[PDB]
Amino acid sequence: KVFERCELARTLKRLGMDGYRGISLANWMCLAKWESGYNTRATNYNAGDRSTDYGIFQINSRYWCNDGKTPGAVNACHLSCSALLQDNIADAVACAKRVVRDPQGIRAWVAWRNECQNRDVRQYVQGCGV
């Protein structure tokens, strides 16, 4: 499913993302916008290391979820990658929280660094009443 913008902002707030380890909800919204356009079924394959990015935050198959076909798969979220392609995003949020408990924090996503870092992310939550 493709979430509406305020619909996703409220769901991420309900699920405890706002201010998780100091990361505001607007940053999480900018990350999902540039990673998937708020789409839970987005999947991007990466020819180099033969890993795939899954779901609304585009979480990678080498380090975080297991799809069974990626070399060097670490599966730090202890999640099948299929769980990141569901319309319910509770498992995608738990895994995104595990990613930012490692030292890099949200800098783990290159799209955050190249597109959200030093951009005004308040635009992403305006009018959602969150």
Q: Which residue has the tokens 């499913």?
A: 1
Known catalytic residue: 53? yes
Given the residues 53, 91, 115, 120, the one annotated as active site: 53
Known catalytic residue: 120? no
Contact 56, 32 (CB under 8 A): yes
Contact 5, 25 (CB under 8 A): no
Contact 42, 55 (CB under 8 A): yes
Given the residues 35, 87, 91, 115, the one annotated as active site: 35
Catalytic residue list = 35, 53
